[PDB]
Amino acid sequence: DYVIDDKVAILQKRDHEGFGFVLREFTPTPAFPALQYLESVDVEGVAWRAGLRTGDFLIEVNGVNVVKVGHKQVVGLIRQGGNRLVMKVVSVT
Numbered sequence: 001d002y003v004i005d006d007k008v009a010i011l012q013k014r015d016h017e018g019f020g021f022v023l024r025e026f027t028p029t030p031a032f033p034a035l036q037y038l039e040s041v042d043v044e045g046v047a048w049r050a051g052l053r054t055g056d057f058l059i060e061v062n063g064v065n066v067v068k069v070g071h072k073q074v075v076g077l078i079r080q081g082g083n084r085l086v087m088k089v090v091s092v093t
Contacts, residue, residue, distance in 0.1 A: 002030035005091040009050045013083045020045025021052060023075075026068050030092050033057050034067050036074050053091060060088030 011019050020042035026035055034057035041047050041054040058066050061077045062085065078085060 003091075003093045004030065004033070005093075007051060007056070007089045007091065009047075009052050009085075009087045009089055011046050011050050011052075011085040011087065013046045013085075015083065017046055019047045019085060021047035023058070024071055033090055033092060034059055035069060036066060036071065052087075052089060056089045056091055058087060059090055062086055 013019055021038055022040045023036050024039060028034075036058040038047075038052065038054055038056045038058075041052055041056075058074065060066065061074060062081055064077055066074050066077065
């Protein structure tokens with residue numbers, strides 16, 4: 001079965017920190033539910049500590065649904081908040 005897990009990730013970084021993660025008509029499937037998934041999730045990093053994971057998709061960023069949005073615009077939405085980032089995500093096993 002597919003077990004979809006809905007999560008909200010609040011990523012709070014100190015000035016000397018990165019968050020520690022990397023990303024990359026669209027057509028869905030539980031396997032790939034959204035456009036922008038996680039490729040790396042540096043363990044013990046800020047991305048890790050808020051409970052994110054390798055393979056986690058991106059559904060909402062800082063309030064904006066990114067289910068059908070490309071890399072450029074989503075990064076610009078990751079950078080807009082500076083030392084803080086709230087992301088709606090979903091794990092599918």
